[PDB]
Amino acid sequence: HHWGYGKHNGPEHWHKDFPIAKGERQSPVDIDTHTAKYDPSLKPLSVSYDQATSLRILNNGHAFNVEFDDSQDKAVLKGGPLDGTYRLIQFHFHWGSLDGQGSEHTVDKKKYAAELHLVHWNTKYGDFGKAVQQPDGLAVLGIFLKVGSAKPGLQKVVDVLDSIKTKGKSADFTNFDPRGLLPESLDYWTYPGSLTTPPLLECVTWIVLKEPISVSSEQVLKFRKLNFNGEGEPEELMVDNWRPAQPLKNRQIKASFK
Ligand SMILES: COc1ccc(C[C@H]2SC(=O)NC2=O)c(OC)c1
Ligand SMILES: [Zn+2]
């Protein structure tokens, strides 16, 4: 599979190798704030990242992933719409060429500069590969980025990017605290969806925070210096690595807040 984000291999082409691209619960979606309904049944959201163990940062030619040790319940997401325990395995971002685009989810059609995805898997399925074959296998916590003041908790990530410029490069990335990427409020929207890259599996409970985080123009500029290509290949800047909004179809987006 040679999927990407260019004219010739981008989102509009994915359906040929991955027919689920036109399925019934695809992500991302536009979040219409005037349609999403407060759900009093949602339990409190619990982000328990105190024992998180980051390992490594990898440029995979699509984004960069910060990977965690998920061999035990060290960093978990629970509560909200979720039944049981979801283990943090990695986070990554999607971003734009310009500050007015980059997010995958949109809010009343507004695009943010970027979007952070913290990917977790349901521990009742034993491993990640099994979890992605289930409708309730993953929980992705999505956080919007806007350009304003610098995010201090992001700078350790920004500073390692020079060392993973091209596809297939990785670097040791220990002792990174993902709590420094969260906004103040955990108010969220939730809906059932999919992975936003191939293989596009319909296995995700999306939890999208309402409050964006602010990052500096300098921070996001350094994201944009990454490369999609491998070392020694013609430079293709890693920008606009986002899938656009997909049809909502027969789904409701629930709000955790009034
Ligand atoms: C096979 O299971 C997976 C799971 C998650 C991703 C990451 C995707 S899903 C998302 O929300 N954003 C992304 O980039 C994946 O990518 C190959 C593959
Ligand atoms: Zn993502």
**Max CA pair span of the chain:** 54
* Cα of 245 from ligand 2 centre, angstroms: 13
Pair of tokens at residue 90: 């990695």
Spatial distance between the Cα atoms of 54 and 221, rounded to a whole number of angstroms: 24
Residue 195 beta carbon below 6 angstroms from any ligand 1 atom: yes
SS3 for 188? strand
- Site to substitute for ligand 1 among 67, 77, 196, 197, most atoms within 8 A of C-beta: 197
Whether 168 and 96 have beta carbons less than 8 Å apart is answered as no
Structure tokens at 43: 């339990």
Any known ligand binding at 13?
Answer: no
CB distance 116 to ligand 1 below 6 Å:
no
Structure tokens given for 87: 């283990």
Task: State how many domains the chain has.
Answer: 1
Catalytic residues, by residue number, are 62
Residue 200 alpha carbon to ligand 2 centre in Å: 11
Measured CA to CA, the distance from residue 238 to residue 250 in angstroms comes to: 34
Question: Could you tell me the distance, in angstroms and rounded to a whole number, from the CA of residue 258 to the centre of ligand 1?
Answer: 31
CATH of the domain at 38: 3.10.200.10
> Ligand 1, from 105, 119, 130, 167: best to mutate by most atoms within 8 Å of Cβ?
119
Q: How far apart are CA 105 and CA 142, in angstroms?
A: 9
Pairing of strands 114-122, 86-95: antiparallel
User: What contacts 31, CB < 8 A, 6 or more positions away?
Assistant: 105, 106, 107, 108, 189, 208, 253
Determine the structural domain holding residue 94 and report its residue range: 1-258
Q: Is 21 in the pocket of ligand 1 (CB under 6 A)?
A: no
**Does the beta carbon of 207 sit less than 6 angstroms from any atom of ligand 1?**
no
The ligand with the least distance to the CA atom of 60 is: 1
Burial of 251 (0-12, 13-18, 19+ CB in 10 A): middle
Give the number of residues written for the chain. Answer: 258
**Residue 14 in 3-state DSSP?**
helix
Distances, alpha carbon 91 to alpha carbons 63, 116, 177, 254, in Å? 10, 7, 12, 24
Ligand 1 atom nearest 199 alpha carbon: 1
CA of 119 to the centre of ligand 1 (A): 8
Beta bridge pairs of residue 146: 214
